[PDB]
Symmetry: D3
Subunit: 315 residues, 6 copies
């Protein structure tokens, strides 16, 4: 009697109210083992905004997802209870207020023992999530991104942008930098002083160039080595992908990962102790016929299958 | 306590699960006095398909709607119980099966005494609705369209298309042709007498040219004259609008009605015995940044205000 | 037996090889009384190019046209022999060569006594057409445009652009300026007297502001007064329309004519001695879901109805 | 010697670095009498953001503008010194900081005696402009909008959004409500009395319905009556236009003003004591082939012609 | 005196009536050795329709194709007689009527000994084609697709959708399942009971994952091994390609084949006994600036070169 | 005191007048060591025009570029003086007049000893550039393209189109064919007589197929071998890339290079004696959300870093 998506043999995929994976909507985190949550918030965006619309369009395109993973044969909704937990509370005018409200929501989700699978929103959304999930013990992370997002300040003394969240997370003791690995980093930078913080912290950084030199299998091996057997969060910024696969994103950088490579890397994360995940920076105003929304919905499903297994083991 | 849309003061319009007008979702028609219903079905389409996606995108853009009509000051959710009844069952592969399923759904809606406000879907969807709502007593209708939709058959012995529903309705005694008025008709025609049926059964047809000659107010008076005080349905085909206002439709014809005009006309229908309405032929695959979906949602809100008064006897 | 478009009762409008109006294709002008011709040429364009693609997309969207005008009840294909004459030869690299080739083609068309209905292409295409059709006796013209297109030269000693064809035509005695009327002119101008030429040679210029003051009917009467009973050409530049109706054009100017207005105006030209017409400046690379291509095809059909009466003496 | 746009006779409109009207760029307000300024800021936006990109795209499309108004025959660059003053400093992350920075910039502009013609940015940008221009003596205003923008607070204790700037302005004594007129207001409203503030402080509000009843000329007379001979600012929110003319905006409402109407209205404001103007809410991420950016550039040119007369005492 | 495309040295590619490859139009199959046919029909579509417009836009974009293949140096129009045979008769309202009418057309094409090179339309179009071409002897097939299209029933007892054609073809004895190989299969499924029919039938299924493990050369070798020297049809569903290359399609699945990989695989089919081919599921309402139309037109040309050689040998 | 881009820590990237890389605008070539120049000219275009708009949209998207290359750590603006030199004079109506005017501009740039980094415009723009830069001594070239652009005549006796420039350049003695290597060539051709001129001239032609067989490293090695230590120009036609990465181009050919591969190949050109470069055939009317403009701006930056080093050594 787990929640199940609308039956596509009966209700065609273009029909029905568009919730994540066409699952039932829930308001109580305790009703679920994995909560699918939107965080429609782009207050942290320094360049092209629009990620506030990401969760709606990912919900929409997630109608194309089916019940069973074709490689792993994981059937997430049979394994555990999955539901659309709605959207976190957000304030488009007041960044500090949104940070507070978002964390408060995730504290409730966490207190119910529910694993969050979240759709942004820009990458600043991951900070208040980590504030909830990393409050008692620090998290490890596999982070897919064109950017490290460990900047310090923007336009004066503003410590909170989509480019600072993991620096903040490390400073706040929420993210363990030795169990952090970043994959796909590329594109022009401000100074040769960017990798300073990463080196100081011991973060493993696999730039696009090194990802290409290693190939998928060896990259994966290095990633799993870094995070080991500890509590691990997966954060997927769609701008890790080449703009050809993910045009709808605020800060594109050419020469990126393919959707195929992203699926292979995420699938190889199976078995880890995964305590949450997100798919961020889908930006519908820059998207093309919902391409990036569909990439987001699909990576969300790939991640759901793995979180279902973790939630199943801990139960 | 009446259903209410999400509070835009606490939940921004880009957020929240996108139901019609961000209202709560309902499975039981008995729960509501006005039922907001999707009919995602375009099996009747003879040219450009895509209206099957219409309800989803109209739902999406209906997030932009607020609580009070700024002219009439009608607050519909306060007046009656409104909600998102979901979508009528549909079958994209079997045309006759869809017809059966939709009618079955609308009979449940009708039996609970709920007035339907529906979003298509192509125009053929109005027939199974009429098979439920006109079953006991025939309907009058204010019909906004570039096309009469009173054709007989297509590509052979095919009697059900988006171009024939109101001929079938008249034949089936569901719709009274003497109480039917069609506004906006225009564009080239297949044969020299396309409207033989319409003239012979007494339908009042206000072509685009005549509506232009008459103007909004006169056009409005003629329409209210035709439907009188009887039970009346309003069917809004977005292709009545010029393609500049409604690009997202299967059968565009240039030289059409403005959105402003559509709003003045529908607003002028206040006070009638409105038993139901629909907005049909929104085709997202042909739409431009959701413009037509927003037109659809807005016309839906205009009609919802009228229907809310009707439901409140 | 007259050429006929594909039967939409047996072949849906999305199907069949896309000729103009889905008519048969012809190589021989002698075969036809009205020749539907593409001039895919934009060598005259000084800003945004792309009108070279216009004829292909207008052909595409002309599939939506049916057999009978719904107002005038003209059935053009029954009246006269109509077909798709293909495209005039063009050279995208050599401007003077294109001018030569197009004129040569149009002289063949003219010598067979066939009336041309042409789709551009930028406005410069009308000149080589006029070099054929106005060779023996000068033309009058009803010209719909945001721009007068009577400039002298561009970027130096360049006398042929989409902005100069009707000055050249007047200079070459192909076009009678006393029988020329231009409707819709608007938008900022290069220099304080852009229309020195026009006022001095006696062209009647109805700016957008005046057309607004006058209205359709008065504007129509003035236009028919100017051209009288003489042989008259109709040249429709889609940029006469507001960008909302015709986004797909090289030189847009806001605050323009509606599609409805364009149709009323052209329809009012019934009964004149029409010797030819064109629809120019459709630029698909700037178009939105084929909106402007459809405007182009539809205006083409409106003009085809008039030309069919003319060809039928 | 007055700044001049690039010569389109020698440099085509698709070429050259894209400054406003292809004018030279300036760092010093003292250099100019009319300053063309970008305010790329949308921190006030409660729904769809993207107006931060507005100035760049309006700059881009302003390349299509020429030197002389074709109706009034005003040649603005000849009358006064005009140029591209660049963009006001902005901070996309810190709302109050942006407010401070923009006001500081506009005080420099004001102190040099330069009249600002600004391109937003969402409507909240007008407040810091008013904090500079209405500092010494209060402004009157002709305000074109679908919305009154006189709300009190959003999502809690937040007093600065694109929906509150003119309430703040009135509260701060920067704007005289008895000399304020708002034209085009329409669309559903949050609560039954959205315009309590407006009626109580004496703002003249011309809803879309009334503007339709009155017509352009009467609407124009009423507006000039309200502002009189006092110092007057003109604020043009592109969402006043129907989405068909201005799709690229954050808060569209259907049934709006045509571009033609917007031009007639602004043109009718000639002769007033105009101390500044802006065009706001152009949102390129929602725009269609730059249509709204071109509307923005064109309305900017219309306003620049008026402001050039004002600056020339 | 074979038909030849409009001469581009004389008539620029944006001009002229847009027939397939700008060839002359034909009404009599007997006039041709290879017939280029549109099947503008998407009655079988269960999700996003629009493939009914595919043949028109593929005709349009096929204007960009030239006369000679740059690798193989095949010049198809010199080798054999090629022409635009127009569109098969279709009924957008009545699926069963379209099936009848389409097969009737292809029976005529087949009776004239003409090899069909067809543009859909959704994949259900391949069924009536096989009903004509496989009527005396069964066909082998190389099938490029994200989906097996061997489903049984949809929404009750409807046996005909774009997802059932090859199951129908096998049941009807038109397609020999031991000489069938499917390449590119990927994406979430309904149950782990999908590959049941394929295993029962002996179809060789090369999922996307296995295509990646093998690489192009070995995949090709396996494909040629399966079909051997027997009569073989090639059916190309553009959704085999990643949405980055083919956005205009009804049922996209991320992480697909590249256009480059598709060209290499098709070229390696040279020499086989190819008796027809199609390019299906181009859906213009979801296409972006005609990208997928051009991919369709180009694969059509790649396939034409190979069919020309087969038609040349059999003559 | 070199010119520097607008400081993004102070002026967000969506703001400020959009010059190349947001640098200051210059009118005097002598003020600069590397000049960034637009050539908004598509008179040579035989098919889909629109490249006349390329320089404007590349300027626009170049706002996303940062100050330092993340691999090479070249900081071009610190190394040498870089500026936006505006656009070359162009005449959209008169091809021969544009050729004259464009060359006259580049003669001035060259006379000041400034290295040009140019954005087209279609590929015919490279001819008048070579007329200026190759006037005293011939140039070598690394040329990335789907097409050789060594055709002879079009539509009669027109020797100047975007498809003839390098034939003209060789005939005029401006380009040394033995130090010319072309990479990415693919797509149907007119006759098997296309590679005639290339073979006669000794041009090294690395077709797409051979690029795939060699891989990036070996291709690069072959390219550097061809041009050796001599004066070398890099000309990058964005249609070398698959339409998935560069949709906005006049003459697309499917199955092309990835943006990632293009970056790797260009980076491997470091150390050569580079005397100019261009990025041509960006066509905004066929572009999708400025994707190709951004690819153009990024390749422009990749090339700038290398030209900065050459300009630094020669100073
Ligand atoms: Mn990130
Ligand atoms: Mn990122
Ligand atoms: Mn209808
Ligand atoms: Mn209709
Ligand atoms: Mn013109
Ligand atoms: Mn014009
Ligand atoms: Mn406003
Ligand atoms: Mn507004
Ligand atoms: Mn398939
Ligand atoms: Mn498939
Ligand atoms: Mn090239
Ligand atoms: Mn090329």
């Amino acid at each position: 009697d787990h929640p199940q998506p609308l039956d596509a043999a009966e209700i065609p995929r273009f029909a029905g109210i568009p919730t994540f994976m066409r699952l039932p909507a829930f308001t109580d985190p305790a009703a679920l083992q994995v909560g699918l949550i939107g965080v429609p918030w782009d207050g942290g965006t320094t360049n092209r905004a629009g990620a506030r619309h990401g969760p709606r369009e990912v919900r929409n395109l997630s109608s194309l997802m089916r019940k069973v993973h074709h490689v792993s044969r994981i059937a997430p909704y049979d394994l555990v209870r999955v539901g659309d937990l709605g959207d976190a509370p957000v304030n488009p005018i007041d960044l500090l207020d949104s940070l507070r409200r978002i964390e408060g929501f995730y504290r409730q989700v966490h207190a119910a023992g529910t694993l969050p699978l979240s759709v942004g929103g820009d990458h600043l959304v991951t900070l208040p999530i980590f504030r909830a999930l990393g409050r008692e013990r620090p998290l490890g992370m596999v982070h897919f991104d064109a950017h490290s997002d460990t900047n310090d300040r923007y336009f004066g003394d503003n410590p909170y942008t989509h480019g600072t969240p993991f620096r903040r997370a490390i400073e706040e003791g929420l993210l363990d930098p030795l169990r952090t690995v970043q994959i796909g980093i590329r594109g022009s930078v401000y100074s040769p002083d960017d990798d300073a913080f990463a080196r100081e912290c011991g973060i493993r950084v696999i730039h696009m160039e090194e990802f290409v030199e290693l190939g998928v299998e060896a990259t994966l091996a290095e990633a799993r080595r870094v995070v080991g057997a500890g509590p691990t969060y997966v954060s997927f910024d769609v701008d890790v992908l080449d703009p050809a696969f993910a045009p709808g994103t605020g800060t594109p950088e050419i020469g990126g990962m393919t959707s195929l490579q992203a699926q292979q890397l995420v699938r190889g994360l199976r078995g880890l102790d995964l305590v949450g995940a997100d798919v961020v920076e889908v930006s519908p105003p820059f998207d093309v016929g919902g391409a990036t929304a569909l990439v987001g919905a699909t990576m969300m499903f790939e991640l759901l299958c793995l979180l279902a297994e973790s939630a199943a083991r801990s139960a």
